[PDB]
Amino acid sequence: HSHGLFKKLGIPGPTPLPFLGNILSYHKGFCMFDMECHKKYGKVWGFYDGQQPVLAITDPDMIKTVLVKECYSVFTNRRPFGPVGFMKSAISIAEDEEWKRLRSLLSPTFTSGKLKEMVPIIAQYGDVLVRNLRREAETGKPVTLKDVFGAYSMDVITSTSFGVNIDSLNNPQDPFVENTKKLLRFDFLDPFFLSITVFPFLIPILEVLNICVFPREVTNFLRKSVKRMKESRLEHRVDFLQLMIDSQNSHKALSDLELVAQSIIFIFAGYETTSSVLSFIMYELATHPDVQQKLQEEIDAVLPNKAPPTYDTVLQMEYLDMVVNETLRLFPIAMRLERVCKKDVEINGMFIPKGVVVMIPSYALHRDPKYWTEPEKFLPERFSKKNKDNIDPYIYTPFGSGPRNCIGMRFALMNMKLALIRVLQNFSFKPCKETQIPLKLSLGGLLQPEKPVVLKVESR
Numbered sequence: 247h248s249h250g251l252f253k254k255l256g257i258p259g260p261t262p263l264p265f266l267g268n269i270l271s272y273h274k275g276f277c278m279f280d281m282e283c284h285k286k287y288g289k290v291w292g293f294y295d296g297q298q299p300v301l302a303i304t305d306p307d308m309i310k311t312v313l314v315k316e317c318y319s320v321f322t323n324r325r326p327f328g329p330v331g332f333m334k335s336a337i338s339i340a341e342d343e344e345w346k347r348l349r350s351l352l353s354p355t356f357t358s359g360k361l362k363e364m365v366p367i368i369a370q371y372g373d374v375l376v377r378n379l380r381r382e383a384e385t386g387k388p389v390t391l392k393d394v395f396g397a398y399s400m401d402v403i404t405s406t407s408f409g410v411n412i413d414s415l416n417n418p419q420d421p422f423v424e425n426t427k428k429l430l431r432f433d434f435l436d437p438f439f440l441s442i443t444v445f446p447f448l449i450p451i452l453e454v455l456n457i458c459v460f461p462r463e464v465t466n467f468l469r470k471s472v473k474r475m476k477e478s479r480l481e482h483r484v485d486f487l488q489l490m491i492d493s494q495n496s497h498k499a500l501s502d503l504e505l506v507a508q509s510i511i512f513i514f515a516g517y518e519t520t521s522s523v524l525s526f527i528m529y530e531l532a533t534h535p536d537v538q539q540k541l542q543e544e545i546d547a548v549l550p551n552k553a554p555p556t557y558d559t560v561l562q563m564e565y566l567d568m569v570v571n572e573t574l575r576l577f578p579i580a581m582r583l584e585r586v587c588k589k590d591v592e593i594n595g596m597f598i599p600k601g602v603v604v605m606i607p608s609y610a611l612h613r614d615p616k617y618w619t620e621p622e623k624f625l626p627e628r629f630s631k632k633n634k635d636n637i638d639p640y641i642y643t644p645f646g647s648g649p650r651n652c653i654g655m656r657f658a659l660m661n662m663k664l665a666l667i668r669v670l671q672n673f674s675f676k677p678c679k680e681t682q683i684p685l686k687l688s689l690g691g692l693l694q695p696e697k698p699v700v701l702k703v704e705s706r
């Protein structure tokens with residue numbers, strides 16, 4: 247096999263089994279595998295997903311080279327991951343020049359400029375979220391964050407991308423909202439993906455049969471919805487769809503299905519991500535009352551008598567930013583960053599052969615006792631103006647880095663912050679019947695709690 251590769255390069259790592267590579271070692275999940283390999287093998291190690299070699303790197307200089315310096319030349323693409331269909335055109339899945347084009351075509355849709363006019367729309371569902379909370383606060387019902395935050399994230403997506411304005415929490419049976427509750431992110435350690443990892447030679451077989459990891463039911467509904475959405479009815483708005491089709495006017499030439507694929511990927515991208523992070527944040531706040539109180543104190547100072555948050559007031563809130571950042575340190579939901587090596591290359595004193603997947607293990611790096619004092623504790627002061635400088639931007643990578651980092655980063659931060667401001671203005675959050683303390687991470691392929699976070703909401 248290719249199983250002698252790392253032994254031949256003098257690169258250490260877990261010894262692999264025939265066919266399986268090292269995938270049995272994922273029985274405790276990616277992040278714990280990554281943590282242990284790091285503690286056992288040091289700064290660089292290798293393992294095999296089936297026959298695919300994967301080189302883990304932890305040196306910031308080396309991480310910078312891969313993510314920033316040699317992105318266009320060598321490390322342009324992610325690992326191809328399964329039968330994908332037309333979604334091959336989605337920006338996050340596209341490769342080389344097709345990616346570079348789509349990235350350029352879609353960049354203007356993520357400038358601070360037009361993010362600001364997205365704010366009132368998002369904001370509108372800040373208030374929606376509140377009443378839904380108030381209804382469950384007044385009746386002292388312990389609250390499923392994942393649900394209420396899930397619905398909020400949906401609402402913000404529907405409206406910001408297509409103009410569909412639905413309180414999804416109380417409209418769960420609406421054609422749009424229902425399996426546009428969707429695309430949930432892929433458990434790459436579930437049996438289907440474990441199998442394609444061992445038999446990647448079966449992927450073209452699935453492709454030919456038009457089998458797709460993206461449910462074609464959901465994909466159908468949307469492609470048509472978008473289509474319909476282009477009568478064109480306008481025959482203003484400031485959503486993603488129109489920011490996307492108004493770019494089809496005036497290199498370039500964004501196809502109309504390609505466009506659909508991006509619409510799909512933006513949901514898949516920002517639905518479960520936003521709501522998962524928002525839940526992890528509320529969990530930390532409830533289990534750290536002083537931090538929650540400080541945050542509410544900051545919010546009431548910037549926005550007196552419960553003032554409506556604005557673009558500029560959001561950015562003004564420093565403790566908020568620290569609380570969001572520190573939650574992302576503990577729970578970097580992407581878990582690893584990856585690029586495929588396109589050419590034989592020697593970087594920072596190490597030769598890396600063509601075809602290796604270079605992997606940066608963000609979860610393991612975010613909790614490395616070398617860059618982080620008492621790494622398991624939730625300590626927002628890590629990110630204060632004072633201590634912020636001692637943080638390496640290639641150790642701390644919740645949104646990746648370089649030309650291929652999270653394109654939706656500014657929007658996600660703004661989104662979450664708006665929601666957290668509006669929520670914290672009206673409620674205090676407290677541990678409860680359920681509350682798994684400490685929180686227990688799932689052993690699956692997703693960075694999420696084992697049991698869903700539930701908390702009491704009390705009206706201020």
Ligand code: HEM
Nearest residue numbers: 338515516519523580644645646647650651652653654658
């Ligand atoms: C808390 C929320 C989010 C987190 C933590 C997050 C994190 C990440 C990370 C770590 C990457 C990989 C970057 C890399 O490989 O260097 C990524 C990629 C990406 N994200 Fe996000 N993301 C979030 C929300 C969103 C949202 C709201 C959108 C879109 C509206 C989005 C769209 C994308 C896209 C399109 C990519 C692939 C970019 C490319 O390949 O060109 N993400 N994200």
Ligand SMILES: CC(C)(C)OC(=O)NCCCCCC(=O)NCc1cccnc1
Nearest residue numbers: 338339431511514515516519579580652
């Ligand atoms: C998942 C797609 C859309 C392919 O984007 C990425 O490659 N991002 C990181 C993949 C890690 C999978 C686990 C995961 O939870 N995804 C995080 C995510 C998803 C979409 C956008 N932003 C962040």
